[PDB]
């Protein structure tokens, strides 16, 4: 168990903040699904996320959920946490940092990626696209099962979304052509299978003409997705501190938070309430390496 209701000042159609019509829509969809033979992921949070993804259209949300359930069983997502071994992670992480550090003002996990060293040919030597997306699915289920529950216990309310920061420092804009396929697949996964899991998505240190580049990706992205994405130049600090306390924001990004050499520095640690024994529960500590 952990807090299951969003704060009351959150949007409607989120748990704890339903009107009678949203209520009836949730009970209807739940009954449809129970009739279909489903069992897992009939909790308020999940179903309201699919409803919200379809503006509370019951038949459309049901179709969404059913396709997602189908893909979970086709991809083997339900055991992926125990059946995927991303052994090449220490290699890829040196091109492509992907880490967490603490929480935002609403309790969301803060997730970071740095793209300035990503080189496609090198990682092509290290891995395949299919495995990188297996790892993406793996990190989604991991944040769901470990990070979000602890985050919810720490905030005192439900937390179901991430605060993501993606640093473009040092990318070459001409590189974007090379990753559309990957982005198309990643976004396809995030939108159809993890709906309503984005919270805020900053893009910092963006180089000039990047707003032009991002156009190549826009035909992949839901409008709800694009409304979450906030593109910034090198003046990102004030904006980040609006959303994350300085104590929780790494020093390289304008805040005051630090990680020691001992603990693996910023990249290799995984500091946050999902590491705190006060806030870990029946799910245990997140896998860590
Ligand atoms: C060799 C093998 C294959 C090769 C693959 C190589 C590709 C690798 C390289 C780079 C990958 C870059 C894109 C990755 C997409 C990340 C999105 C994501 O996580 O999903 C988000 C959906 O959000 C979207 O759908 C929006 C994505 C658009 C922004 C990306 C364009 C910037 C690229 C600039 C171009 C620079 C080019 C660089 C060159 C100097 C969800 O966000 P969230 O909920 O906050 O996150 C969930 C948290 N979790 C995931 C931890 C669970």
From Swiss-Prot:
<dbReference type="InterPro" id="IPR001251">
    <property type="entry name" value="CRAL-TRIO_dom"/>
</dbReference>
<feature type="domain" description="CRAL-TRIO">
    <location>
        <begin position="88"/>
        <end position="261"/>
    </location>
</feature>
<protein>
    <recommendedName>
        <fullName>SEC14 cytosolic factor</fullName>
    </recommendedName>
</protein>
<dbReference type="GO" id="GO:0005737">
    <property type="term" value="C:cytoplasm"/>
</dbReference>
<dbReference type="GO" id="GO:0008525">
    <property type="term" value="F:phosphatidylcholine transporter activity"/>
</dbReference>
<feature type="cross-link" description="Glycyl lysine isopeptide (Lys-Gly) (interchain with G-Cter in ubiquitin)">
    <location>
        <position position="73"/>
    </location>
</feature>
<dbReference type="InterPro" id="IPR051026">
    <property type="entry name" value="PI/PC_transfer"/>
</dbReference>
<dbReference type="GO" id="GO:0015914">
    <property type="term" value="P:phospholipid transport"/>
</dbReference>
<dbReference type="GO" id="GO:0046488">
    <property type="term" value="P:phosphatidylinositol metabolic process"/>
</dbReference>
<dbReference type="GO" id="GO:0030437">
    <property type="term" value="P:ascospore formation"/>
</dbReference>
<dbReference type="Pfam" id="PF00650">
    <property type="entry name" value="CRAL_TRIO"/>
</dbReference>
<dbReference type="GO" id="GO:0005794">
    <property type="term" value="C:Golgi apparatus"/>
</dbReference>
<dbReference type="InterPro" id="IPR036865">
    <property type="entry name" value="CRAL-TRIO_dom_sf"/>
</dbReference>
<dbReference type="GO" id="GO:0006896">
    <property type="term" value="P:Golgi to vacuole transport"/>
</dbReference>
<feature type="cross-link" description="Glycyl lysine isopeptide (Lys-Gly) (interchain with G-Cter in ubiquitin)">
    <location>
        <position position="31"/>
    </location>
</feature>
<dbReference type="GO" id="GO:0005829">
    <property type="term" value="C:cytosol"/>
</dbReference>
<dbReference type="GO" id="GO:1901352">
    <property type="term" value="P:negative regulation of phosphatidylglycerol biosynthetic process"/>
</dbReference>
<keyword id="KW-1017">Isopeptide bond</keyword>
<dbReference type="Pfam" id="PF03765">
    <property type="entry name" value="CRAL_TRIO_N"/>
</dbReference>
<keyword id="KW-0333">Golgi apparatus</keyword>
<dbReference type="GO" id="GO:0048194">
    <property type="term" value="P:Golgi vesicle budding"/>
</dbReference>
<keyword id="KW-0653">Protein transport</keyword>
<dbReference type="GO" id="GO:0043001">
    <property type="term" value="P:Golgi to plasma membrane protein transport"/>
</dbReference>
<keyword id="KW-0832">Ubl conjugation</keyword>
<comment type="function">
    <text>Required for transport of secretory proteins from the Golgi complex. Catalyzes the transfer of phosphatidylinositol (PI) and phosphatidylcholine (PC) between membranes in vitro. Essential for viability and secretion. Exchanges its bound phospholipid with phospholipid monomers that reside in membrane bilayers. Regulates specific trans-Golgi export pathways, like transport from endosomes to the trans-Golgi or transport from the plasma membrane to the vacuole at the level of the endosome.</text>
</comment>
<keyword id="KW-0472">Membrane</keyword>
<dbReference type="GO" id="GO:0008526">
    <property type="term" value="F:phosphatidylinositol transfer activity"/>
</dbReference>
<dbReference type="GO" id="GO:2001246">
    <property type="term" value="P:negative regulation of phosphatidylcholine biosynthetic process"/>
</dbReference>
<dbReference type="GO" id="GO:0006892">
    <property type="term" value="P:post-Golgi vesicle-mediated transport"/>
</dbReference>
<keyword id="KW-0963">Cytoplasm</keyword>
<keyword id="KW-0813">Transport</keyword>
<dbReference type="GO" id="GO:0000139">
    <property type="term" value="C:Golgi membrane"/>
</dbReference>
<dbReference type="InterPro" id="IPR036273">
    <property type="entry name" value="CRAL/TRIO_N_dom_sf"/>
</dbReference>
<dbReference type="InterPro" id="IPR011074">
    <property type="entry name" value="CRAL/TRIO_N_dom"/>
</dbReference>
<keyword id="KW-0597">Phosphoprotein</keyword>
């Amino acid at each position: 168990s952990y807090p299951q209701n969003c704060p009351p000042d959150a949007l409607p159609g989120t748990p704890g903040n339903l009107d009678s019509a949203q209520e009836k829509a949730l009970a209807e969809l739940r009954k449809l699904l129970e009739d279909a033979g489903f069992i897992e992921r009939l909790d308020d949070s999940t179903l309201l996320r699919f409803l919200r993804a379809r503006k509370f259209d019951v038949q459309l949300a049901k179709e969404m959920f059913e396709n997602c359930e189908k893909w979970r069983k086709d991809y083997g997502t339900d055991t992926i946490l125990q059946d995927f071994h991303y052994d090449e992670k220490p290699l890829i992480a040196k091109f492509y940092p992907q880490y967490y550090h603490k929480t935002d003002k609403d309790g969301r996990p803060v997730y970071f990626e740095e793209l300035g060293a990503v080189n496609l040919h090198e990682m092509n030597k290290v891995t395949s696209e299919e495995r990188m997306l297996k790892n993406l699915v793996w990190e989604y289920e991991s944040v769901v099962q470990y990070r979000l529950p602890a985050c919810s216990r720490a905030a005192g309310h439900l937390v179901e979304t991430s605060c993501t920061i993606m640093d473009l420092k040092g990318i070459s804009i001409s590189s974007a052509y090379s990753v559309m396929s990957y982005v198309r697949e990643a976004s396809y996964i995030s939108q159809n299978y993890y709906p309503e899991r984005m919270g805020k998505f900053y893009i910092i240190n963006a180089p000039f003409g990047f707003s032009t580049a991002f156009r190549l990706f826009k035909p992949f992205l839901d409008p709800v997705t694009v409304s979450k994405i906030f593109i910034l130049g090198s003046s990102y600090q004030k904006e980040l501190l609006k959303q994350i306390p300085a104590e929780n924001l790494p020093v390289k990004f304008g805040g005051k938070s630090e990680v020691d050499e001992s603990k693996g520095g910023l990249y290799l640690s995984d500091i946050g309430p999902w590491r705190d024994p006060k806030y870990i529960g029946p799910e245990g500590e997140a896998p860590e390496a």
